[model samples]
Structure formats: structure tokens, C-alpha cells
Target chain A: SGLVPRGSHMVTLRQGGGTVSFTDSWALLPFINNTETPYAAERAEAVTAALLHTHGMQKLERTVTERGELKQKAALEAAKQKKVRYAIAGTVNEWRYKVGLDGEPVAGFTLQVIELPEEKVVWSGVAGKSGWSRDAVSAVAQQVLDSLIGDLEKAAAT
Target chain B: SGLVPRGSHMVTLRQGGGTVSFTDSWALLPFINNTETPYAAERAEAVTAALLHTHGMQKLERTVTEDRGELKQKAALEAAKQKKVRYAIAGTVNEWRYKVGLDGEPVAGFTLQVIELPEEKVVWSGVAGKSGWSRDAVSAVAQQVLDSLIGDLEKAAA
Candidate 1:
């Protein structure tokens, strides 16, 4: 409704948002990049992690694996070994500095959390935003992530 | 192999490593954190995703859902069902913070898993950790750790 376009944001909760145990371990997977920008996804990734740190996620971990069968196989094994209970994963649909008199930074991303063992999704969100011409691209991305993460925090708190 | 220290380091792989098809679709789950510092898992997650992209992941997606206690499993089950992915990758971050000392270097440790869905069994798993200079970003340390882990996975697949 605001600077963020209508279709630009979508959040689906298979089950109504519920409480997640911060005490239980949580994981964050790499975001997929759907843009032509070489490192658009990576840039967003760095910012998202930094923001989550400021959000009071004391015990968070990251993961890496090949796509397809290997990826899933590796995740389940790590879940058992680490005893992880919840995890977050998503994609970066767009990440680029707009071109014009002023190059405004823009970012779009989606995220979701899953419960381990059962491997079910508990919460999910998607959002996109643009910043002032002088704003840092990472800053713009951070703002977008902050909005989405804030929502996740609120859901978890309830 | 000789160890004199009480808690130098320890690692265990409950199952034997195996190969997974590189062509299968994949979904990444969030990571679990077990450290005092916040968002450590998130940092690692981003790095892992980037590394996988570089390793030739053609079809990758991140899943989002709610945090219902028992219903959490349904999110993952549905994600796989909807994505029609053969595998999912998940993991944890045991240590992701600066070491306490004169240098106070960045250090990160984690375990990764590959889960074959429908059957929901682990096919491959690995663990690795590393330390970096004081000026180094935590994500860099996580990248190195994931790189090493993925290298191991590649060898197993070969």
C-alpha cells in the first residue's frame, strides 16, 4: 500500500502464525537469485544475516549444499546432527540499483521458516522496496528484510 | 593421531556419505543456531546458498511457512510436494562469532545434511569449521567452512 507495491508483497501462512522456540536451534539457507545482477543474491544475503543478528536471534546457523537430491539429503542429516528445530529459507527475486538521474536502490525477497523432522513450513513472507537515490543498495535491502523480519518476530512473539 | 587436550575437537558422521543427482530440484530450509551471538546461522545460510549456486545448482528455491508445533512438519512436506523437489538441504551453526583473545578472529563451525524427501532419509552429511583474521567478516569464515564441506560432498559424488 505504501512505497511497496501491492503485488510486491505476499505472505502465506499454511497454519496461522504460531510461536517458535528461540531456545531451539534455527537455520538460514541461501537465497535464490532471479535477477541478472551478478551478485544481487549475495548482496541481499549479507544484509539479511546482519539484520537478523540485530533482531535478537541468538542461536542461528547457515547451510550450504548442491541442488536437488543432494541438497535435501544433506539438510536432513544436518538437522539430526545439529538437532535444529526451525529454519528460514527464501529467494531474492530482484536486486539492483535503479537507473536514472538518481540511482535508487531496490530489493525484493521472500522468506519462510520450517519445522525440522516433520519438515513443515510454519511462516512465510515476501516483500520488495526501493530507497532514496543516495541510499546504499545494502541499506535498501536491509530495510526490506527488516520489514519482513519484523513481521516474523511479531508472529513468533504471539 | 594423538590428542592430549581434554576438549580440543571432536566429530562424528553416523551414516556413510553417498552420491546425489545434480539434476534434481532442491529446496533450502532455514538453519538452526546454538550460539550466544544472534543471526550467526543466517550469515552462514547466505554464504551456503551462494556457494551452492557457484557449484552449479540450476533449480533452487527457498521455502517459507508458519511455526506451529506439530504442524511445522506439514510445511516442509507441502513444500516438497509443491516444488516437486527430490531433495532439501538444512543445517546448523554451532559456533559463529569472534574468538575471544588478542586477535579475536572470526570463527564458524557447522554441520550440513541432504535429505531425500517422500522417503525423508539422509543421504550425505558433513561438518567443518574455520577461523579468520580479526578484520575478516563472519560470513567469510562461514564461506570457507561451507566450501570445504561442499568439496567433500563433490568428492563423494564423484
Candidate 2:
């Protein structure tokens, strides 16, 4: 719990996940980009990676799986090799600027904690927020994941 | 146009991809998952495959490639030639997210193309983005974008 908060008040989450430990590794996959804008998922993914880094999660090398076996590519094998307990993925629901009037920035995402082997969504949450005209999409997205992933990190301890 | 609300649009790149008659052999390669989400490319390809089925056209069967994006695509070219299809389809997913607002509109963007085999010329291509209401799902939104691109390809063929 010594991970530094991004200087914003976070209310944390209401549930607990499977007990996690130093031995239990986590896989971070780029959340699938769900927006019409390009790179929205990667942009948010970078922020999620940095934040999850605070908790010791690592990224798996990307590789194609047999058609529908997405959640378990290099990730599942890594789970078998490493002691990875969970694989985290997300949906970048929104990451862009408005066209009208102010051109403000908006960022929204939904994170899923896929339990390894079973490949199911054991834990998940959604967070979205708007920023002023001058705010960078990265900054807003960072804060959103801070709150969302922070909830997961907090639950990992219980 | 009358009461039929065709609330979406598209942009043309290369034109005249050949007649692409329903009887022609076609192969669909996995789309490049340009977004952060894992396996988005495959999922979109699945949706397109389903749509192609409804149109009385069928996609070629492919074995496990176990390759990444660029390499997977190269293999697909060989696959098309091996399967002896007249045309191959491939594209990239740019934006795929819901907007952050009261409505939380579902937004999707995509680029698709028709490749003439043996000669391997990119005969036709199209790209576009669109948004759906908060009531819509991302998969539904994604299909809409893909449908428009294919619609254009068919129109040009016609």
C-alpha cells in the first residue's frame, strides 16, 4: 500500500478479490480500443501500465492466438510459467475531444480482471471523467485509472 | 433519402476493386488491432465474417497461424493464394470507444479494403467512423462501421 497516489482523493472499492501476494503475478494487456478514435486504447493502456507497475504487474509479449482465444495468448502460457494469477484487460470507451464549442477532453474506460486458466471476468469496473480544454487526455485517463485500478489494487490485499 | 435515416458516412481511398460478384471466392484476413484492446482485430473480423455470411458470400477457412500482426498478414496473402480466392479483405480498427457524457454514445471507426489476388493489387478501400446511442453495444456499433465500408465496396463493384 506504499504506492504513491496521484495527489487526488480516491474513495476505493467495496469488494475484495482473491488473495494476492508477492508470488502472484498479474498480466497487463492493452485494453481493447472501443472508440472510433485511433490509439485511444494504447493511450489509456500506457497509463494503466504505469499505474499497475506500482503494484508489480508486467505486460505479456503480444501474439496471435487461435481465433477466439484472445484472453489467453502469451498471457495464459505466462500464467503457467510465471505464477501469474490474474490478467487485466480493458475497454477504452472514450478518449477524445469534443467538436462543438469548447473542445473539452473526455476519457472513460472499463477494466476487467480475468482470472487465469478459467479466463473469466472475476473483477471489473468502469470510470470516466471530463477535463478542461487545456487538460491532456493522458492526464485525465491517468486519474481515471488511478481510481479504478486503485480499487483493484486495494482489493488485492484483502 | 426520405424517412430512411442513413445517419452515417464514409471516405474512399482506392476505387474499382473489381466486380466482387457473390460467386467469387473471398478470403478475410484478421484485421490489425490498432487499438489497445487485445484481439479486437479478430473479433471485428468475426463480425465481418458473419455479415458476409448473410450476404450469401463465404470466407475461406484458415488454420492457426500463431503469428503477430504484420507476419499474420503476410501469411494471409499466402493463404489467399493457396486457397485460390479472387479477393482478400483486410483492415485496421482505429477508434472503438463510447463517448463520455450523459448519453455515453457508442462510437466506432474502421478501415477496410479489397485485395485482388495473384496480382495482389489493392483495388478498393474505405474508412469511416460513427456513433450510436447509449442504448447501443460496442459490437453493434463496430458492425455498423464495417457494414458501411463493405456496402461501398459492393456499390463500386456494381
Candidate 3:
């Protein structure tokens, strides 16, 4: 049981035998704002910070991509240009809430840690979550991402 | 010289050697159409036949049913595994429509994957986009994209 409360709160699918090496140089590219709501992609940076800093990785460099420059393509180009081995890139599908009876906070996104050169999407997952009235959407975003990348941290082998 | 004029194409930076045996079987499935362009699926089907023939593959196999416009990559790979072929090719046409302008040029953003069957791992892939001559046919432009993509696939892991 992680911070996401597990069970009904989250739905996820992960790649089999998919893992990233701790020894590999890693970078986080811009997550596509391919969203439904305005400023929905604002959490992209926050998510990137959560991904790298979860393991206390400060030396992991940053890579910026052109708007509409295809996340995977941008990730690969940035990885090669930055001389890194692996990169994280994804799309923010949804980041807003619903106007239902309770006014719940919701967050939905997909993440992938891609291996460069070969362009293999080693680890991929869809993290969909909904938070209660008291919780903020950003806060819920953190919880789900931490749980997602948190599980990813366990797969790292140096 | 492969006459396919390269126009901003990209393929994975493969490892040391590049030699997939000519005896290996190939499975090319219906490409998923991401664009609203009609007949993208049928056009890709025809292009694949020509592509396989150019690569000297007489044993190409595929599975087809009526009404397919999205997400058939799984079917292709699974069918490839059942057929015991070494490679299965899946594709996506992200942009296949003519750009609206005074000229209305034919353009396409194409992608193809060569999945190693049984393992179902993507061994090689290509991503490319280009605009054809004002009077050029979409089919002609597509021919190059498929051929160039197969050109990349033919030179991967043995």
C-alpha cells in the first residue's frame, strides 16, 4: 500500500521486465500538454521534479523540447544531444476536476522512461487518480506520481 | 543507391552489427490511421506489399478483417507470434492529409515498427514526415516513406 490509497483510487498498467538502471545517465524531457483543460500541462514540471528528485537525483540534467515536437522524438534527440542514456517523457491527458455532486479533484497522465539510441520504451504506465474534496489536484498529482515513480525506484539496479 | 529521397527521417541508432537474415519471415499488419484521411489503411497495405517485395521477402504474412481504423498493433504482433515469424511490422499514420493552402500539398507524417515476434519487442522503427510536390500523388510520397522505413529495418540485429 503506497500513498495513493491503492485499490479503487488508481488504475495502472506497467511494462513487464521493464526497469531503468541507476547507473545510467538520465534526463527528463518536457511532457506533452496534450490535454483537455487549459493549463492542464502546468503540472508537467512538478511531475518531472518528482520523478528525478524522488531518488535524490540532482545531477540528472534537464531537457527542453519544442512545442508539438513529439514527446518520444524530442526525448530521444534531447538524450543524444545531452549525452544521456535514458529519458522520461509522457503526455498529460487530464489534470482538472469534474463538477459532479462532490467536486472531486482528478489527475490523469501517462509516463515512460525510454532508453536512448535504441529508442526502447522500457518502463511505461498510465496513472489515473481522483482526490477527495479536501485534497488539491496538484497534491493528488504528487501522490499518484510518487506512487508510480516510487515503484519505479525499486526496479533500479546499479 | 536507395533512390528514396530522405527528408528529415529518423531511425534508432542501432548497435554494432546489422544483419537480419533474408530467410526470416515477415508479418506486416494493417497500419493504424491517426489522421482523418480516408483510405490510409488501404494505402499502407499496398505500400507494405511493395516494400516487402523490394526487400526480397516472398513469405510475408498478415491477418485482416473488415472495419479497422485504430489500434491493431497488438493483433499484428500476436498473429506474428502464432505464425512463428521472426518479425512483425506495425505502422501508424499520424498525418496523411493534404495541407490546406493555395497549393494544398500532399503530406504525411509516418511511423513504422519492426517488432521481433515471440518476444514482441520493437527491434527497429522509423519516424518521418514530408510534403510532396504540388502535383505529386500521396501514394508516391507514401511509397518512399515505407521503403525508407524498411530500408532501416533490413539493417538491424541478426
Candidate 4:
């Protein structure tokens, strides 16, 4: 059987793991691009927002504020105004392909749900996936995001 | 100016920040691959070992033991005792792939943890990701990640 590297898909529940209500308000901050590939994080933000919407997250608020400490501060202010309870944020770890005959696309990212007011991390996960030569980069990204989002949904339900 | 993402390129020194001897013996454990890409973990392991060697880690030992959570930890402990090494390095390959577009750049991401042995406590931890030219080898991308992480590690030591 193939082994997963220890930190490859590590998820840490730093604080709360209690169930969250989808009916509650939600916000998505811009994701950070740690990779050299331009717009990598922007691409992830769009996919993440769409996935959250597909999972019944209607009226998801999008933040135009810059990312980082200030972004969280801005998110908190937005949450207060919008009565948003949970805020989603993350970083794009990888958004490119390997050099070979296949030239398969790869996507990797980590996401966290922060509780407003307290600003504590409730749930966070890191994951990565690769697709065939013919596959779209977004499709590959969607696979990983789908799995992570599913995990959050399940955690919230329980 | 836009606020840069917090923790985007940040490296946290969880434990040891003091100077460490590069001449100290070291052990490398197998890497985990959470991605669908086959041998992604193996490729990371090879690259990591090469980087360590390049950094003057002369007495390095590698373990082929299966990568079960507790099992690998046990293996690391055994290897450290047997090799008389003071430090053990381990990590995961979150992403290893290429872009699908016309450019087809290579991208990779991973996290590394350095453990102080016998005590079996984590001394340092870091995460890094990067993209390279389409013609760049995967090993080259891996090297870049290692270099960045190690650079931070060196800073912490200073």
C-alpha cells in the first residue's frame, strides 16, 4: 500500500470542533498565494466560494479587504455588520504542474474556519491532488476542496 | 500597498531556536503523500535527503519502514538511537504537479518538522511551496522549498 507523507495532509483542530449551523451567516476572505504562480490564490478563492455555495451556503459574503492581519480585522468588522458567525480563510500552497510527458496538473491548499468575535480557529485542513494531462486545473483543485469542505460539513453537522 | 497575507511565508519556531551543529548526525524518515500522484512522497524523500546532504549533514541515515503514524515515530526513535543522531527530519508532500495551461510550470509544496531525539520532541517546523519554469525538474522545485525552509531555520538559529 502507498504511504502518505506525515505532513502531506495534516489537519489540526486548534480550538472548537462543535457543530455549526449553515443557516448562520458566513464570509470568505481572500486566500494568500504562497506560490510564485500569479493569481494562484485568487483562483482558489473563486473555487472555494463556489463550493461553499453549492453546499447550501447562500448569501456568502466576499471580502475585498487585503489579506493578512488586517484582513482578519476587516472580516471581524464585516461579520459584526453582516452578523456573520463563521469566516473562511486559507492559503494556496501549490498551483502548477510537474514537468514530464504527462504534465499533469496539481493543486494543494489549506483552509480554516474562524469563529467571529473570538477569532479562534474551529476547523482547518490541508490537502493536495493531481490530475491527468487532459484534466483542468480547477477540476483538480475542486477535488481537494470538495474533500475538505465535506469534512467541515460533517464536523458541523455533528 | 496591499497587506500581505499573514503566515503566507511565515516560519514559526515552535521549539529550538538556538544554534545547531550541522555536523550532528541526522536521520530521514519516509515522507507521506496525500495526493493521488504515485511516488510523490518518495520523490520528496529523495529530494529532502539530497538537500540535507548538500547542507553538510554528513552522517545521515534513511529508514524504509512503513509510514504508519505511530510506527514511523517508533522507527525514528530506533534510528536515532542506533545511529546516535541528535536530530531527525520528517515531513509531507502536499502538492507535486505541473500546470495544465500552455505554460505548464512545475509546482510543489511540503512541510518539514525537525525533532530532537531521545526526548522525541519537535524542535522546528516549517511549510513551503513554489513554482518553477516548465523546463525545471521536480527536484529543482523541491530544492527551492527546502532552501527556503532551511533559510528560516538558519535565521531562527541566529
Give the winner by TM-score.
Answer: 4
Model 4 lDDT tens row, B23-70: 777788777664556777778887787777776778888876343243
Quote the positional error of residue B22 for candidate 4 in Å: 28
Q: In model 4, where do residues sit more than 4 Å from their true spots?
A: A1-14, A65-73, B1-158
TM-score of chain B of 2: 0.82
Model 2: per-residue lDDT, tens digit, A1-158? 00010112223333344575423556666456655677665666667777777756554433233211244345556664665567666667667775322344667676767676766666667667657667887778888888887777667674
TM-score of each: 0.43, 0.47, 0.46, 0.49
Q: Model 2, residue A105: displacement in angstroms?
A: 12
TM-score of chain A of each: 0.78, 0.72, 0.78, 0.82
Task: Give the TM-score (vs. native) of candidate 3.
Answer: 0.46
Q: What is the C-alpha RMSD of each candidate to the true structure, in Å?
A: 22.8, 19.3, 15.8, 12.6
Best by the lDDT measure: 4
Q: What does chain B score (TM) in every candidate?
A: 0.77, 0.82, 0.82, 0.77
lDDT string for model 3 (A5-109, tens) is: 111133334454645675568877666654456545546655757666766666575654332336546556867888887777766644665432244566756
Worst 10 residues of 1 chain A by lDDT: A1-10
Ranking by lDDT: 4, 2, 1, 3
Interface RMSD of 4: 10.4
- Per-residue C-alpha lDDT of model 4 across residues A18-127, encoded as one tens digit per residue: 67877687888777665667877677888898999899889788976432445545665777677778888777766776444335677877788888767777887777
